[PDB]
Symmetry: C4
Subunit: 219 residues, 4 copies
């Protein structure tokens, strides 16, 4: 297949951990049903397919009814567009094949939405960064434009699985220019580093450590 | 009805979340009795009505007996005044109708008290800010004066639902000039932003994000 | 009785909370046996009386055997001295009567020890400050000298009720000159404020609040 | 025996706690089986001896299979070398006898690996410092060179006992020049302080405290 964002996340850590992923055995024993977001993700998107695949099945129906509340979100879930459609493109600079498959893509006005669920909508507002959700904006937006004509509107639709004051809050987030850019420079920086490993068949694994700030080694 | 503080809190977040509130269905299933503060709130204020509406009913009686201890608080609960009385007024600048209903209002000396309960009286001293309790001072004080003659004394009566060293501590807090002001500028700023949405029927929902401080994107 | 350190801790917070203490009813229902330190405190000090007043009674014996390990501590528990002996004195400046009763006082070399127990010996090293244990040094040391001739050696004997790597660590701490002083200025500052309330029969209860650092009200 | 790193860690805290260790009775009652790392540590190293000494015995097999994934790690576990081999040497400066026994030592290319397990591979990246794992690099590397010819490559092999996204991540860490050095200066500084106690038979136990940063005693 191609290089997804989930991949550039591995090279980001350490080039080696990239091919590690594609080997380390998993413990096939999904015991928690915690992927309620995976469920929500399907409810919101594939509405029929949803009925397929506890006393929690009520939350999912309540949450979904919550995003239908705020207009901008209701518009997103509705409108006219495609869902899991994949997108492929060669990165101009590295010539590498990239792949990203936007949760929902509204053709008419070039809008890309991405469903995500959390426990703290407030925490999100700063957490996203460590999930590299800005690199996920830059990366889909770049692959999108570079295949459909122009940079789309990337909008994160976040929903909470932790009722607050009687309801389940929802929030539509968009990446700020300063960050959208940082993300674009990150994946390219990632792509280049991935390109070396290929041609020069070497994938460093050693993560070098450096004294922390509180290090008494300098007050 | 009018625009409460609880409303300007929504526009504060995002103009959209304001009309969201007035639509998102709640999960009518109050299972926790955790609103002991809601109870306390009634014990302290509506003394008779309280007997109406577990092995916890003892705490509520103990707490209430704790605020009767420190003089200033005992004075507050006693004295002569009205309780849930609503207050209405048009904001001079926006002409919008505002509403706020002070927990207890002592006419004689223009004192407004507001019962609140927490787990850390120490945490409160800095937490209040994220609950926008300063905007709740400015907003009641402004609506009060602007309807009774002069700015009252706003005093938060906080009580803990987490015994410490044998008792349940209570604390009367008042907003400091620097903060009381910040709160007054916030709600006005909120009101104005609310006034746009009305006349210009548009309510932005997209919350734009910005790189966090620790962002390696600049060391 | 007199004014203990535990009292100046109340006036420190708010003059009112001082006379609050002496009124707020307690919930006489000691259900936890958690005061294992209260126990330890007796084991280490009143060795016989200890046998008086679960599967935990083994820890207390193990801990006590741990402080007997490091020499300085074993010396402390042994040596020749008095225990709960109270000490009384008028504060030269305020003329107020002060009282403090050192856990163990070794006459021969003027050593005052104070048994204390915690969960993190590492946390202590910075936590003490919020317990005002430095004001407890200054206050006992001052009352001591001012009654026995000279400033003693104040040493905190801390023990953990949370085994680590197979044992229960113990640590003898002493207050650093910079802090010992800060503590001495605090209690005096406390004493003076206590002296006003007496002569001017007024005890403010209102704790004025001030915007926190992260207050967006200034970036 | 000699002075291990685990010892210089005690003198580091307080010279006394060093001889404390060698006296404080332990509570021989290993009830938790939590030393799964101790197990892992044996699985990875002593492969046969492992079969000797629950529904968790599957994780250990899964983890071990995870480090075999990333090449650099698989190389480490394989290759040709000795395991628990001890190493002894006199510290040139203090003349003291030092001892350190590297988990795995690959002779051919002078590589020293050290198996360690954690809950947060991300936390490690900054936590190590408080475990003094940099002093454990400097100390083994110094004893190694100073006995085999040259400074080896010290590599920490960390593994998580907390599945993430379906697998158990592994990470090979190496100490950065800045830190490797800080560690070397620490143990020497430790050794010297240990040398005093010996010749001058005195072992201070009192840990002097100093006001914390947030100390209102200076804003």
């Amino acid at each position: 297949p191609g290089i997804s964002k989930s991949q550039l996340d591995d090279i980001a850590d350490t080039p080696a951990l990239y091919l590690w992923r594609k080997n380390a055995p998993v413990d096939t024993t999904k015991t928690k049903t915690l992927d309620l977001g995976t469920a929500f993700h399907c409810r919101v998107l594939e509405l029929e397919e949803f009925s397929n695949r506890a006393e929690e099945g009520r939350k999912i129906e309540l949450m979904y009814q919550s995003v239908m509340a705020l207009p901008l979100g209701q518009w997103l879930v509705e409108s006219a567009g495609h869902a899991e459609s994949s997108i492929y493109w060669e990165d101009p600079e590295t010539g590498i094949l990239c792949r990203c498959r936007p949760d929902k893509i509204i053709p008419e006005f070039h809008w890309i939405m991405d469903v995500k669920t959390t426990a703290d909508i407030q925490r999100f507002k700063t957490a996203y960064y460590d999930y590299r959700y800005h690199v996920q904006d830059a990366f889909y937006s770049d692959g999108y434009e570079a295949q459909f004509g122009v940079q789309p509107t990337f909008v994160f639709l976040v929903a909470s699985t932790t009722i607050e004051c009687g309801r389940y809050p929802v929030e539509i987030f968009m990446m700020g220019e300063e960050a959208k850019l940082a993300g674009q420079q990150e994946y390219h920086r990632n792509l280049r580093t991935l390109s070396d490993c290929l041609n020069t068949d070497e994938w460093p694994a050693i993560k070098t450590l450096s004294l922390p700030r509180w290090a008494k080694e300098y007050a």
